[PDB]
Amino acid sequence: TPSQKMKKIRAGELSPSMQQRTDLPAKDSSKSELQLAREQLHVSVVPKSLPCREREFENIYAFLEGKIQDQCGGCMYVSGVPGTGKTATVTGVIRTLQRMAKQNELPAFEYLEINGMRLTEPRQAYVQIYKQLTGKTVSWEQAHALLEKRFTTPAPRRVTTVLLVDELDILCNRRQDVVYNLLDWPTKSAAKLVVVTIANTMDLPERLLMGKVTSRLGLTRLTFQPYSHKQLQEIVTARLGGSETFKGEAVQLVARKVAAVSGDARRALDICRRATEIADTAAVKCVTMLHVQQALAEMIASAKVQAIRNCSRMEQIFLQAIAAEVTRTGVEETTFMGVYQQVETIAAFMGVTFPPPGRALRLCSKLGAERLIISEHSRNDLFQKILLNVSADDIHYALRV
Amino acid sequence: MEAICSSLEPLFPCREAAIETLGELIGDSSETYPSAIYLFGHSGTGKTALTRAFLKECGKRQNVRTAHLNAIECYTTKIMLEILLDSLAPDQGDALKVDNMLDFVEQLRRQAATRVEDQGFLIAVDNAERLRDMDANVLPVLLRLQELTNLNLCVILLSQLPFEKFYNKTGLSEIVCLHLAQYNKAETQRILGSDFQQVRNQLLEQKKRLEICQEAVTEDFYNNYLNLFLSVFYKACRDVPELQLTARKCLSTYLEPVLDGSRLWRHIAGPLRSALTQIYMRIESLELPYYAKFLLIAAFLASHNAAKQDKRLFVKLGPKSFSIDRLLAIFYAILEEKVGLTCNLLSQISTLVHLNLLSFVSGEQNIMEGSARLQCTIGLEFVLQIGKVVGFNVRQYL
Amino acid sequence: PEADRELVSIRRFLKERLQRDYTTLRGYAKERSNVRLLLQRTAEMGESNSLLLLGPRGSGKTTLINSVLADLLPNKSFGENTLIVHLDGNLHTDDRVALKSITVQMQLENAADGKVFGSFAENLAFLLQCLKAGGKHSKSVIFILEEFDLFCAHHNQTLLYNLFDVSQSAQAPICVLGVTCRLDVIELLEKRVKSRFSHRQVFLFPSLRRFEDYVDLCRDLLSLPTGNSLLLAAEKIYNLQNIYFSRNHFDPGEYGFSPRLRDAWNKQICKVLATQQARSTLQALHDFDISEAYLKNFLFRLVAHLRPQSPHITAEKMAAVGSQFEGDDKIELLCGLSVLELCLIIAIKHHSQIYDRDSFNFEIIYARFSKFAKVSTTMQAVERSIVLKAFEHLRIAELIMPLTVQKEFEMHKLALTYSQIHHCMQRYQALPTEVAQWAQS
Amino acid sequence: PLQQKLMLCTLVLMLRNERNKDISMGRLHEVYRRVCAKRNILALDQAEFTGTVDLVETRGILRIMRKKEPRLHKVLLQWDEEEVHAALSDKQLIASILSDTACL
Amino acid sequence: RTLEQLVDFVVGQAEREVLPTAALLTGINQPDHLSQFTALTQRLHAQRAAMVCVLQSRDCATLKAAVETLVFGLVEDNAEVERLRRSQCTMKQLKSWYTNNFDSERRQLVVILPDFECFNASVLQDLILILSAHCGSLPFVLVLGVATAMTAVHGTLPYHVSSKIRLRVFQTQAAPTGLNEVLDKVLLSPKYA
DNA sequence: AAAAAAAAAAAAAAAAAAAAAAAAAAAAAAAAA
DNA sequence: TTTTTTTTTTTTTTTTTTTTTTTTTTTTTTTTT
Numbered sequence A: 001t002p003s004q005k006m007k008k009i010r011a012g013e014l015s016p017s018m019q020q021r022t023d024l025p026a027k028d029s030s031k032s033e034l035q036l037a038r039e040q041l042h043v044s045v046v047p048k049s050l051p052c053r054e055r056e057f058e059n060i061y062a063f064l065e066g067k068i069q070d071q072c073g074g075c076m077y078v079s080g081v082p083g084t085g086k087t088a089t090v091t092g093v094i095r096t097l098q099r100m101a102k103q104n105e106l107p108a109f110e111y112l113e114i115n116g117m118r119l120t121e122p123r124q125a126y127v128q129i130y131k132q133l134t135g136k137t138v139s140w141e142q143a144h145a146l147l148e149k150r151f152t153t154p155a156p157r158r159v160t161t162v163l164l165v166d167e168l169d170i171l172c173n174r175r176q177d178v179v180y181n182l183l184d185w186p187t188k189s190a191a192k193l194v195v196v197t198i199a200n201t202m203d204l205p206e207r208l209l210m211g212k213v214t215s216r217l218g219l220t221r222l223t224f225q226p227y228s229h230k231q232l233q234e235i236v237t238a239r240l241g242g243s244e245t246f247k248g249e250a251v252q253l254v255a256r257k258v259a260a261v262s263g264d265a266r267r268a269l270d271i272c273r274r275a276t277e278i279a280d281t282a283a284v285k286c287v288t289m290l291h292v293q294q295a296l297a298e299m300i301a302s303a304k305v306q307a308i309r310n311c312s313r314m315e316q317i318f319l320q321a322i323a324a325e326v327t328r329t330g331v332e333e334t335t336f337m338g339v340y341q342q343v344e345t346i347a348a349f350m351g352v353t354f355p356p357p358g359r360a361l362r363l364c365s366k367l368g369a370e371r372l373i374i375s376e377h378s379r380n381d382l383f384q385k386i387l388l389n390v391s392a393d394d395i396h397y398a399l400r401v
Numbered sequence B: 001m002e003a004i005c006s007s008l009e010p011l012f013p014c015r016e017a018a019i020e021t022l023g024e025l026i027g028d029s030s031e032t033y034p035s036a037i038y039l040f041g042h043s044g045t046g047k048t049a050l051t052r053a054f055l056k057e058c059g060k061r062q063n064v065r066t067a068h069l070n071a072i073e074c075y076t077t078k079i080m081l082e083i084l085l086d087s088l089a090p091d092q093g094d095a096l097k098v099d100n101m102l103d104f105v106e107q108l109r110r111q112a113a114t115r116v117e118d119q120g121f122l123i124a125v126d127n128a129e130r131l132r133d134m135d136a137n138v139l140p141v142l143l144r145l146q147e148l149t150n151l152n153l154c155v156i157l158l159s160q161l162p163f164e165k166f167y168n169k170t171g172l173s174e175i176v177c178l179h180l181a182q183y184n185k186a187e188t189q190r191i192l193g194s195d196f197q198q199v200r201n202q203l204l205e206q207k208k209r210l211e212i213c214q215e216a217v218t219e220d221f222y223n224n225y226l227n228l229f230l231s232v233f234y235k236a237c238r239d240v241p242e243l244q245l246t247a248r249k250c251l252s253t254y255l256e257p258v259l260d261g262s263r264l265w266r267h268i269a270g271p272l273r274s275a276l277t278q279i280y281m282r283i284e285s286l287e288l289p290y291y292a293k294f295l296l297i298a299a300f301l302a303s304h305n306a307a308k309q310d311k312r313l314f315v316k317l318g319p320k321s322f323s324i325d326r327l328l329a330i331f332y333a334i335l336e337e338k339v340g341l342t343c344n345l346l347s348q349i350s351t352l353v354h355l356n357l358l359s360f361v362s363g364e365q366n367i368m369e370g371s372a373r374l375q376c377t378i379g380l381e382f383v384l385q386i387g388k389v390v391g392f393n394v395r396q397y398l
Numbered sequence C: 001p002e003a004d005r006e007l008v009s010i011r012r013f014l015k016e017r018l019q020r021d022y023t024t025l026r027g028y029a030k031e032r033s034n035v036r037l038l039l040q041r042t043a044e045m046g047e048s049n050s051l052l053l054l055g056p057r058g059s060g061k062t063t064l065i066n067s068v069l070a071d072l073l074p075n076k077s078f079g080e081n082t083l084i085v086h087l088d089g090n091l092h093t094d095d096r097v098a099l100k101s102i103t104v105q106m107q108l109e110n111a112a113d114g115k116v117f118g119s120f121a122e123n124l125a126f127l128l129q130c131l132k133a134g135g136k137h138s139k140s141v142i143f144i145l146e147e148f149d150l151f152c153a154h155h156n157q158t159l160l161y162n163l164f165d166v167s168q169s170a171q172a173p174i175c176v177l178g179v180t181c182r183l184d185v186i187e188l189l190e191k192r193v194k195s196r197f198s199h200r201q202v203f204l205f206p207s208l209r210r211f212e213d214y215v216d217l218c219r220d221l222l223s224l225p226t227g228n229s230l231l232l233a234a235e236k237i238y239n240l241q242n243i244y245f246s247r248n249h250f251d252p253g254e255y256g257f258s259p260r261l262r263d264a265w266n267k268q269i270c271k272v273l274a275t276q277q278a279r280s281t282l283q284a285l286h287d288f289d290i291s292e293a294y295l296k297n298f299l300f301r302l303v304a305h306l307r308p309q310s311p312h313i314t315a316e317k318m319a320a321v322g323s324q325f326e327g328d329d330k331i332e333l334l335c336g337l338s339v340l341e342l343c344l345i346i347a348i349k350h351h352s353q354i355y356d357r358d359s360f361n362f363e364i365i366y367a368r369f370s371k372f373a374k375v376s377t378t379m380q381a382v383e384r385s386i387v388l389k390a391f392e393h394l395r396i397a398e399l400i401m402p403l404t405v406q407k408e409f410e411m412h413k414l415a416l417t418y419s420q421i422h423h424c425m426q427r428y429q430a431l432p433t434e435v436a437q438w439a440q441s
Numbered sequence D: 001p002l003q004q005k006l007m008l009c010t011l012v013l014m015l016r017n018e019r020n021k022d023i024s025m026g027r028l029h030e031v032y033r034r035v036c037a038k039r040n041i042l043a044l045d046q047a048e049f050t051g052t053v054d055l056v057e058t059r060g061i062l063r064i065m066r067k068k069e070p071r072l073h074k075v076l077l078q079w080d081e082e083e084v085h086a087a088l089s090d091k092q093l094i095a096s097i098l099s100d101t102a103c104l
Numbered sequence E: 001r002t003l004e005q006l007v008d009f010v011v012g013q014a015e016r017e018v019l020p021t022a023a024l025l026t027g028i029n030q031p032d033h034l035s036q037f038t039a040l041t042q043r044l045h046a047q048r049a050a051m052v053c054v055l056q057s058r059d060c061a062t063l064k065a066a067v068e069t070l071v072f073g074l075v076e077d078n079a080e081v082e083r084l085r086r087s088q089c090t091m092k093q094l095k096s097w098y099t100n101n102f103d104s105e106r107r108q109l110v111v112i113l114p115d116f117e118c119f120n121a122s123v124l125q126d127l128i129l130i131l132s133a134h135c136g137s138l139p140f141v142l143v144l145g146v147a148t149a150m151t152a153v154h155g156t157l158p159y160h161v162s163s164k165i166r167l168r169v170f171q172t173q174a175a176p177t178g179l180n181e182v183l184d185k186v187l188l189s190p191k192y193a
Numbered sequence F: 001a002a003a004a005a006a007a008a009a010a011a012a013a014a015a016a017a018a019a020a021a022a023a024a025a026a027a028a029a030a031a032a033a
Numbered sequence G: 001t002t003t004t005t006t007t008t009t010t011t012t013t014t015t016t017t018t019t020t021t022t023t024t025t026t027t028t029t030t031t032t033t
């Protein structure tokens, strides 16, 4: 019976494994140099020593080593825009401290991790923390009671537990009881809990956290600033290593065009991979700057000119008429009746006949599904409101030239 | 497809083009069906009965499984899916269980079979205007159920509106629209004269009158009667069931000088323009208490008579709203007996609200607090009848 | 008679090729190659990717995915080291329903014949525990999410955040496909979901904007193919069915045409499409909508007319189907009203032309109608209730819409234009001259 | 980043030269396109501009009122203009944006 | 007398699409009327001509609650003459129950609406459309409880709704007449001291 | 009496509370031996 | 008479629907000219 399977799953007795391949995977001797550079430029291949994040590594390592050696516990809050190496630096500090604990240079500790976006409710945070100490899946009330008995009652020899909370702002709700429980357990003396919380917004503790929760969160913060173009160039150049599959100016072009938009590292590592896949098709062993410009045109896309260029005749007349009605009445949100009057004017100027209003609603629905315009349901015909989602100069560029 | 059209053309005269198109599209199950057909028309055009008879004849003569719905019944989507999977996957009993659209699509996918049997499915969703009031994924999945379930099925939608009312903010798939245009005068006369044998046998069922009946109640006589009927009735309605239900009664009146013993347009032209005035009433003096009568005409004067003029008329568009203090003030002003404000008077106000002679335009949560606003919902003739049976002239106070 | 059975076979072949045949794709030489090489690099080399097919509704988005999958799946290197999870945003309207479907389609340990045990949170924990425990030694999962913007509308985009997080992590090599009709779907993502999405987007604007490609497509959709091409297509379809659409596909091995019949049919088709009336009808259709679904709808209604008394396709049949397409429908609803509703609509048109589209009422329109009905010598004997029922019939047919009060006093709007009523006055049968004269002034 | 500088400069310009603080995302992007047209900079489309505005909102400089459509989101500045001018530290650029009134 | 007329109407519908309905023009005094309907129900349980559900206006705020109350009333009326959940009561279960019970023998399905004026209008129109759609499947008779006049029924039933209606008007004797009869035969009767 | 602010109220989105359904667990009845 | 199996009822847990809070926008009232 599968109820024994679920009994052993909720107790953690059988491991959740996955199906395996019938073919053995490829060897690194059969791969080309461009395939090896494509494998090293994958964002999932995180390096052991991260470039450009040495000072943040020193900060987090000093905090965590002090909180482990002092046997006290506390809390830290790191933050920054996505792709700036927050979780990679924090888990690298955790791996370095675990390597130092395996060689008796440090007191031992137990490292738990949760992610606020891998939970469906914040209360299920209690189900995951208790699933990382014992391995049993219980209800959240029983898990919260057992965690409360673990962290309030003193018991020698308790070991230090370092709790990582990714995406803290998903645990914040109207009542703020999960985040208050996770930031209140370090304040007790019997709990050797160190809570490091990672998020994106810098002003999160003052924006949406209550006064006691930002009172317990602390003032030891760290901000992961976005990467400059020198830093993206150093990241990608360290990913490539001793190969010469990339040019020295191609990496600089990716770094200059990515560091100006977001400062993300995932964006640079994906645009370089797309450039590698473009250069693989053109039968060249290196990635020149033209493949990089082609990949930067494809990944940083802007395809609202080609969509208007590929519309039909009546749809382009409708797109001219919405812009002409916006010019005529001044306001941006135009009803269907004035748009249809301008349709009749433009079609009588062009000399072609137009469909009746029942098919003009079909043209409006086709343009609204593609989100070239913003339209309502067609149940209120001749009085439905139309916004022009594309700019008015884009239509005059797409149709004139 | 010729057998189904040749079998439906006796039952539906003057619909040979519509039955021809429906036999071209979904007539033969050995050929593939379009993804969705949408046939639409006015009321009384015969689009419930035609698709119902078409689906029954296709299920009898061929290997299809039919389902006829009504989208008014489906207050949730689980009701619609339960009816659909009950009719499309029969002999299932109380084991039928459809959670959502996904379970419906998987259980329809399991109903596929081999190619040599030539099976098909047909779904008729009558009153389809309600489909755009449902949970916003019913209509886009119904329009592509053939592609989704990988079946030889067609979804027939029936409504009184064109398909231009159905386009939503995300778009819809393609559909084969079909128009059932309402009949003109000659086609309507042909439909009304199609039941001549039934009318003749029912008349002969109900003895010199029977002998003088069976000599001339013939087809030309019934067609001249239908000409005299449609000369007066066709301007107000073209709806075929109403014309049938009134033409039978006017024939029952029309045959009186013929059975008793030109020359016939006058004796029916009395009752024909008597019965034209009672079209759309399918029928085969409001007594009130004294103070309820006075409260009702006081509410009429409160809604009608321009509340700035209340300072002059009693102190000695649309119906305007009033508060119950103004109603009681006008009631005590026009009664001139000055009865006691007991509980029965305010109970009469509440039960005149309850009987839909008044209404609640505003308030309804501060009824005792003075912010509730009422409105009178009767006409002038009833107020004049009340003032006549009481003796109080309202036109003096109007 | 033999000449009718061959036409039944031709009509059945053309209808089944138009409706079915989910794998044959026309055009898209670069986009199909991009999607195919991406899926093959995921399955063979174990890479994790994400992709977004974009384009208008009616272009070959699902057909490109079906063509790529039907060409990759009988390889027995893609077919044996890869499991495929199809999700649809119209059916999987919740992350819970989508997660039960992912758990069933991956054949996980808590599935047990299509009835997943555990809650939504337990199913998410078990799915991420299975995907985290994998690596390059495990099978590749290919998630194909159609109606992707509906997956963007879920709670916290939480399933999206997880499906894009296994792609960015040293876990089981999954590949995420997103097939949606919107062009600005990437501004519906949150900043973390947008950061984890590899921004490669494939755009599928149709390559039949110019009219000669439209005429070539209308020729290739109506032609009978060569028997060797028929045998090659039946070979590929039987091969993909040897290992989902393949249960009911086109399968052109059942149809065999003689060379003289195919010769006569293709000569007739090219002779018809060379004319000016057929090209004028295709020009009207190409002016309205350039997608292939509209043309396939036209050609289905054209092929369904092939009765054995009239076997050939001719240009007047195409003109008749174009006349069916191009007409207005509210005008044809207006020609079915009685004369009482027509005088009511003329009174509404007079009120809107005088007062500049002010909202009207039953009493205003009834007064304007009763001023005409006193001198008409045909509408003397209409009551108030019959005109109220005619007003209600105009209201429920949505020729009159409310501004969203008593029923005889609720305000309204005319849902027609003046040109539609002016064409109704010309197309109406047996309209009396009093109404036709009152409509002018 | 440069595109975030050109976003904040355009929002400061539209808050200076107009008394209406109801600034949408499309109305901000239409002025930003003219601004980057005058600087000979290839401006982002709407899809990347929305992510740029969100990445500036993570710093706390803005606040985005979310609506049914991303064109109708309302950007509300929550810093003083001296604070924005100090945080950019790019005086030769913002001095040129505020002198470019004609592209509004 | 009016009870015998209504029973003959139900039986003559059973001896026989639009649904047969019967507007019963009662007085403005509503709490006097429902007991009258109870007497009709007893006579309809005498000849085994039908089984009767009563739909109060308090139970029919929405269409879902009206259909659930209708099916639950009919099923519990059959259970009491000779338990489903609230969300389980559907028209499909009513059709299956009527096929399992009374297709072998037909009982009409009399639906009594005692307070016709106090109904939500859209709920009442959609309920009449639901009942008229199931004609031929389930034999429905619709008894109304109109208190004011027939102008109210003609006003609140639109064109498309009254296109599926074959009503026959009955009349009850007036409340002043009943008062004068009670005063003549009881309060002035000599056999009370 | 109109222009403009201003407080109150309505609409709508979003989060929580409660009801309902479904599964787990414990108690009871009936068969196994 | 004692043990094991299958039914029934209770309690817990999860899902869905309804209510409540919260933000935004409108809107009718109030002050100034």
Ligand SMILES: Nc1ncnc2c1ncn2[C@@H]1O[C@H](COP(=O)(O)OP(=O)(O)OP(=O)(O)O)[C@@H](O)[C@H]1O
Binding pocket: A042, A043, A044, A045, A046, A047, A050, A051, A052, A053, A080, A081, A082, A083, A084, A085, A086, A087, A088, A089, A199, A200, A235, A265, A266, C168, C191, C192, C195
């Ligand atoms: N300094 C660096 N050197 C090398 N690789 C880097 C560096 N910073 C980031 N990366 C790469 O970019 C990715 C960033 O992922 P990471 O989880 O660190 O981002 P994050 O800031 O946590 O994002 P989010 O806030 O959205 O969770 C990593 O997978 C890593 O491979």
Ligand SMILES: Nc1ncnc2c1ncn2[C@@H]1O[C@H](COP(=O)(O)OP(=O)(O)OP(=O)(O)O)[C@@H](O)[C@H]1O
Binding pocket: B011, B012, B013, B014, B015, B042, B043, B044, B045, B046, B047, B048, B049, B050, B191, B240, B241, E160
């Ligand atoms: N051409 C016709 N020949 C014979 N009878 C017809 C014809 N058209 C309609 N009828 C009759 O009209 C009756 C009612 O029509 P039906 O119920 O189909 O109207 P409908 O199209 O459903 O309108 P609604 O949707 O408003 O109810 C049917 O019983 C049918 O017999």
Ligand SMILES: Nc1ncnc2c1ncn2[C@@H]1O[C@H](COP(=O)(O)OP(=O)(O)OP(=O)(O)O)[C@@H](O)[C@H]1O
Binding pocket: B172, B173, C018, C019, C021, C024, C025, C026, C027, C028, C056, C057, C058, C059, C060, C061, C062, C063, C064, C181, C292, C293, C296
């Ligand atoms: N490039 C193409 N090659 C072959 N057939 C096509 C092509 N484009 C469109 N079609 C035809 O258009 C019809 C719909 O195509 P498809 O299902 O690919 O569109 P879609 O993008 O999936 O539509 P939706 O977005 O509504 O699901 C199909 O019948 C298909 O035969």
Ligand SMILES: [Mg+2]
Binding pocket: A086, A087, A166
């Ligand atoms: Mg992270």
Ligand SMILES: [Mg+2]
Binding pocket: B047, B048, B126
């Ligand atoms: Mg009907």
Ligand SMILES: [Mg+2]
Binding pocket: C061, C062
């Ligand atoms: Mg598709």
